[PDB]
């Protein structure tokens, strides 16, 4: 029943685990990873601020987790160079799966499918 | 240049605040859902303000953060029950997003609005 939006600490760990895992996967440029890392840390700081306000409830963390994941998908679909879109997508799925195992120990495959669908949706809009 | 929420950090912040102001007058969402959406909108505004003070709010990052904001709003609408039908929630979001454009650029970007309405549906089907 444990998820990356159960509490702020797990949410932050999930994002840091994702970025740490993604940086060692193909399909992205150094500039793209820098953008994704900048947003990742911005979201960590948002969670830390909400936690200090007692506002980091599971529902809000679940929304922030989607904000983070959709940002990653948007960058992958919108920033050119570094590899094919299928490579970028599979790397995101791989990184997400590892982030789950490293955080909660349980992969949420439905969540991963949502993100891989977002990559496609955002690519279609461009 | 720097005349849209995808190139001007201030307009991105205004866009998110304006979205919430328009949504608060439309039906379909419980008080807790509007609080969730309002808190997230505020979190993303503050993220943009922090990056912009560092010169790091580039158009690529504003584009990602704007889609992050919209995807979060759609996720709250599609996953938190009660308050109204998905049709109402969706139509209210489309209206609120329209005012957010009207208040910022004065020009509604219909592909963007349509994209967000589809996100509500996609996140809903994933439940």
How far apart are alpha carbons A30 and B38 in whole angstroms? 34
- CATH, range B9-127: 1.10.274.70
Which residue shows structure tokens 């609080």? B35
CA B62, B63, B64, B67 dihedral sign is: positive
A9 class by beta-carbon count within 10 Å (0-12 exposed, 13-18 middle, 19+ buried):
middle
CA distance A124 to B75: 20
Residues in chain B within 8 Å Cβ distance of A57: 36
Crossing angle of helices A8-22 and A30-52, in 10° steps, is 170
Q: How far apart are CA A44 and CA A42, in angstroms?
A: 5
Q: Which residues have a Cβ under 8 Å from the Cβ of A87 and sit 6 or more positions away? A: A26, A27
- Distance CA(B75)–CA(B120), nearest Å, equals 6
| Residue B98 contacts A, CB cutoff 8 Å | no
Here the tokens at position A64 are: 């922030």
Kindly list the domain boundaries of chain B, sorted by start residue.
9-127
- Tokens standing for B120? 């509500």
Name the experimental technique.
X-ray
Task: Spell out which residues of chain B touch residue A63, defining contact as CB-CB under 8 Å.
Answer: 36-37, 40, 72, 75-76
Instruction: Kindly provide the resolution of this structure in angstroms, with one decimal.
Output: 2.1
Residues recorded for chain A = 126
Q: Are B56 and B1 in contact (CB under 8 A)?
A: no
Q: Spelled out in words, what is the top-level CATH class assigned to the domain A8-126?
A: mainly alpha
Whether residue B49 contacts residue B99, with contact meaning beta carbons closer than 8 Å, is answered with: no
């Amino acid at each position: 029943h444990t998820t990356p939006w159960t509490n702020p600490g797990l949410a932050e760990n999930f994002m840091n685990s994702f970025m740490q895992g993604l940086s060692s996967m193909p399909g992205f440029t150094a500039s793209q990873l820098d953008d994704m890392s900048t947003i990742a840390q911005s979201m960590v700081q948002s969670i830390q601020s909400l936690a200090a306000q007692g506002r980091a409830s599971p529902n809000k963390l679940q929304a922030l987790n989607m904000a983070f994941a959709s940002s990653m998908a948007e960058i992958a679909a919108s920033e050119e160079g570094g590899g094919s879109l299928s490579t970028k997508t599979s790397s995101i799925a791989s990184a997400m799966s590892n982030a789950f195992l490293q955080t909660t120990g349980v992969v949420n495959q439905p969540f991963i499918n949502e993100i891989t669908q977002l990559v496609s949706m955002f690519a279609q809009a461009g």
